[PDB]
Structure 1
Amino acid sequence: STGSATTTPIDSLDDAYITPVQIGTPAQTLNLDFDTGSSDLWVFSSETTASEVDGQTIYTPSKSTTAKLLSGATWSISYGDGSSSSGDVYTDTVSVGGLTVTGQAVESAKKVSSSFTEDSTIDGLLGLAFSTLNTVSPTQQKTFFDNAKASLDSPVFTADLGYHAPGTYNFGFIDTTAYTGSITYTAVSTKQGFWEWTSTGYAVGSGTFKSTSIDGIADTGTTLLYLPATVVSAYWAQVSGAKSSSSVGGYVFPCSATLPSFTFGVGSARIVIPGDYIDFGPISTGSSSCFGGIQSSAGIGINIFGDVALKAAFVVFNGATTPTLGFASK
């Protein structure tokens, strides 16, 4: 089997992407944030504290004939941005772009943190990291991808995120019309539960390529590109007036600037992030100070190839017995 679904930016900055997901019988369609950096499929629901729901579409298990409470199971997650959610668990039928999993764990939120409430466009998350990170207790649950894997034509999914435009998540096949040149594959470590890999270096604008190993995660659920302070400083030094602002919480730059591109290495191949992808606009409405899309990972504890990086590529998440990541230009 295969699936194919369009993923759409939630706003004009590509802060995140939502993909429609059918849950239950009859289908309840929720727009979920596909997140290769976590492993829980959780939704706003009829059980969510009413004051914590503000415009989201909810899953109502009692209206699904295929929903079954997973007795005794609870979940609770905290994300890298300090947001969180928790609740109980149902199993139900879940379909993405024509690909159906029966008995998928659907984690129903009883509580969500303010950032989730405040984002009306995101009805929940669909985790696509490794199932070892799943938070369901006392019986850990599998991701949608893990459950689908054996039925898929090929045990892969691909992320093709758009810049200020829709893109695609595919399951079970590689669309050879969706990228240019070749896909370069690189090794993955699953030791931390992430799609963790090592970039071979970077360049800033038309500058020479610096060969250096950068260990990081491919994370569709993180907006920006977080890299070591040395790398980030080298980037922003090429933007007149750019500076790190503790009050704002990262590098800002004059909105009048033209940003240089940023290149990252995948083996001997190179992915170029155009400068415009690195512009996240005014820090506040009407400001002439703009927020940068490349930020320091110092104090995160890990480098993160988030949407800024991934949207410059066609990315293969290969879930074969030995997982790998593939990147192509597009």
Structure 2
Amino acid sequence: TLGNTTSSVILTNYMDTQYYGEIGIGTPPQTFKVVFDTGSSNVWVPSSKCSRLYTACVYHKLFDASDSSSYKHNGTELTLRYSTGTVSGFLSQDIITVGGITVTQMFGEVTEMPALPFMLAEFDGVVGMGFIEQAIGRVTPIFDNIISQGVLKEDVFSFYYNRDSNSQSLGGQIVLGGSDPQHYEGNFHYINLIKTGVWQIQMKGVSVGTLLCEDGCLALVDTGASYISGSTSSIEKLMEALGAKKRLFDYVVKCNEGPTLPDISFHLGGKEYTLTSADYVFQESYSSKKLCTLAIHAMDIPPPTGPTWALGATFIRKFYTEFDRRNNRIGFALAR
């Protein structure tokens, strides 16, 4: 059932790598900064029950069930394993407000929150925008619960991620139930999902200056990933072609060579989605003696989802993305 509501969540852009918005949990609302992540399907925030020996819990907002009159205990343990780290804790139910939509939502109260990486998170928690099929503990995801209310105009949500800057700039925007034509131009071009249950599409090629994915591969369209990622062997080849040098967590080029690195193009559906070096180089200098990191990383995502590329914020900054649950497709349009 479809209504006439669309709702928007204003996002903050932290250093082009973490895009997060606000949710309120409980009565009265406890506010949390959260990443909205199409790569996962669970909601979690740090818990007041998190031992303060987890320094990440000292440095983030903690949900306190004992201050919420709308809290409903559950207590089933859950562990959520992401590509960059793991959190563990237990299930709780409470009222969650997101863009002025209020939903009764089961979520994780995280009691184990590793300092690496979570001391480096500006956000507190995560709101998974993936399908119930990938939800740990079969917890109904938030967007599914919003859809059940029958208020949303369309069974879709859309992501705009801005370039960083100053504070008057909008970091980004999620539209629940539609899209915002203020943040894209031209027409959407749609690629059907490989299957329902994951925001993943076929990719027909990756070109540097068709070097890779020549017989097709997978692209997870991942709003919770900072970067474009490929498999180690893909990225090793991609980076050799860019003249980039591998470091522990990233690849770098000499900053003076950054501006003249070749275009990288991603063949999705009918269209080529092209990034110039300005879209994937963190140009912090123009010096031959400084190293500039690339917004393309190696990430071996395990099966059944991987091996797969992930199109994260690096991609979404250039291409406004609509996630269409009704038609099991993803639409891209040129962001403005």
| TM-score tier after normalising by the smaller chain length | 0.7 to 0.9
Which position in structure 1 is the counterpart of 2:91? 89
The residue identity in structure 2 corresponding to 1:44 is P
In 2, distance between residues paired with 1:229 and 1:119?
Answer: 24
Three-state SS of the structure 2 residue aligned to 1:93 is strand
2:173 to 157, 164, 168: 168
CA contact (8 A) 2:265 2:272 kept: yes
* Shift of residue 204, structure 1, vs aligned partner: 3.3
In structure 2, the residue matched to 1:142 is: 140
**1:4 equivalenced with 2:8 (yes/no):** yes
AA aligned to 1:266 is L
What does residue 129 of structure 2 align with? 128
Distance 2:250 2:122 in 1: 25
1:155 has 2:137 as partner? no
Q: Contact 1:202/1:209 (CA < 8 Å) preserved in 2?
A: yes
Q: Which runs of 5+ in 1 are unaligned?
A: none
The question of whether the paired residues in 2 share the 8 Å contact of 1:271 and 1:329 is answered with no
Counterparts of 1:164-243 in structure 2, within 5 Å, are 164=164, 166-190=171-195, 193-205=197-209, 213-227=216-230, 232=235, 235-237=238-240, 239=242, 242-243=243-244
Q: 2:159 corresponds to which letter in structure 1?
A: A
Give CA-to-partner distance per residue, 1:116-161, whole Å, 9 cap, x none: 541352111111111122223xxx2111111111322110110111
Alignment of 1:304-315 (within 5 A): 304-315=310-321
CA distance in 2, matches of 1:116, 1:199: 30
Alignment of 1:114-125 (within 5 A): 114-119=115-120, 121-125=122-126
* Structure showing the higher helix proportion among its residues: 2
For residues 190-216 of structure 1, the C-alpha deviation after alignment (integer angstroms, 9 at most, x for no partner) is 46x4201012334435x9999752312
Structure 1 residue 172: deviation in Å? 0.5
- Comparing 210-219 with 25-34, greater Cα deviation is found at 210-219
Distance in structure 2 (CA, Å) of the matches to 1:210 and 1:132:
27
In structure 2, the residue matched to 1:270 is 272
Task: Give me the TM-score of the superposition, normalised by structure 2.
Answer: 0.84
1:324 aligned to 2:324?
A: no
Structure 1 residue 98: Cα displacement:
1.5
Aligned residue pair count = 312
Aligned ranges 1:49-64 → 2 under 5 Å: 49-52=51-54, 53-64=57-68
Cα distance change on mapping 1:227 and 1:209 into 2, 3 Å: closer
User: Which whole-Å CA distance do the structure 2 matches of 1:204 and 1:214 have between them?
Assistant: 16
Give me the whole-angstrom Cα distance separating, in 1, the residues matched to 2:114 and 2:278.
31
CA RMSD of aligned residues (A): 2.6
Separation in 1, partners of 2:277, 2:70: 48
Distance in 2 between residues matched to 1:161 and 1:296, nearest whole Å: 22
What amino acid sits opposite 1:59 in the alignment? F
Identical-pair percentage: 24
Please say if residues 225 and 306 of structure 1, whose CA atoms lie closer than 8 Å, have aligned partners that are also in contact. Answer: yes
Supply the AA of the counterpart residue of 2:281.
Answer: D
Give the distance between the partners of 1:219 and 1:133, measured in 2 at CA.
14
Using the alignment, how far apart are the partners of 1:208 and 1:180 within structure 2? 29
**Counterpart Cα distance in 2 of 1:157 and 1:260:** 32
Q: Which amino acid aligns with 1:186?
A: I
CA contact (8 A) 2:203 2:213 kept: no
User: Residues 266 and 327 of structure 1 are in contact (CA less than 8 Å); yes or no, is this contact kept in structure 2?
Assistant: no
Deviation at 1:238, TM superposition (A): 5.5
